[PDB]
Ligand binder design. Structure first.
Ligand SMILES: [Ca+2]
Ligand SMILES: [Ca+2]
Lengths: 97, 98, 98, 97
């Protein structure tokens, strides 16, 4: 419940990870400096893996949090991600349910 | 000291293009996808390269992520000067071209 | 999926209290401190403990930080359901009591 | 130019630091989880040192960035800070220029 928006560029090769039913798509974003790891789940992990990659210019919206581990780092739980249409063009396709 | 703003929702009008010598405006109305089991309507203004990307890529009904700065115009209407707009990839797919 | 919002500026009206059985509303208008060498006007609504803190602490002219969620009401007016409000300590001092 | 807002509590004893003409007032904030270091400068460092302390409930607005050093961590360059009047009361005093 700390909302957060970052506009920038994916700077790593995203990675998919599975947890049975569920899917995570993870990547790093740089802003224009801020470096943050973005985590997409579900249908968002889908849209993003199908559409974006390293070097793409991106708009990320979600919630910011700290993740402690064996250091502690700052990450986004994304709720919406899109390509930044100031820097590119997109063909949009809906996914039949 | 501008007021930053983000809205996620859907374009709900047919966007309107306007040219001013060099410059281009593309503007449209956005409704936010709030849920109860509370709505937000705003006019978004895209300029420049952003106007171009958006007119080539999005239209009435499409899901959107809009980032920019919020303004009131007493002319009184609440408007966003967008800095980045994209389709919402939680609700769609995009084939990206530069 | 509410739309979060933050505005920093000044209260520019005398706030208005309204009671509804248990509940209290304190509402007022805010202008944002934008600079040129572009304004934003919004109605802010505080409820509950926030209505109490704000009525005890702030009034017309005071500098404010407002955090909450943004709404349009077609009744059409743009309003904030505030979650946290405070004086802007870049422009003032506050002696805090709980 | 990545804007950011956090509402929470100061959880360390703030510290003042000087650089000649200029003053920094630094403290840690927790949200309701996110931990972030907040940096106030100038008149903001003033208002905040004069008004707040460990345990106070706070509204922080500014810009988020990453700071690299001998690790890298996420910090806020605050532009406005106030006590959260949902959790307290305040007497406001203007500072004659
Ligand atoms: Ca990949
Ligand atoms: Ca101290």
């Amino acid at each position: 419940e700390t909302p957060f928006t970052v506009v920038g560029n994916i700077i790593t090769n995203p990675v998919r990870l599975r947890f049975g039913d569920q899917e995570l798509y993870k990547f790093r974003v740089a802003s224009n400096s801020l470096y943050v790891t973005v985590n997409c789940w579900g249908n968002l992990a889908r849209g993003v893996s199908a559409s974006l990659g390293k070097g793409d210019s991106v708009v990320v919206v979600g919630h910011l949090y700290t993740n402690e581990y064996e250091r502690s780092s700052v990450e986004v739980r994304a709720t919406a991600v899109g390509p930044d249409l100031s820097r590119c063009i997109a063909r949009v396709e809906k996914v039949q349910p």
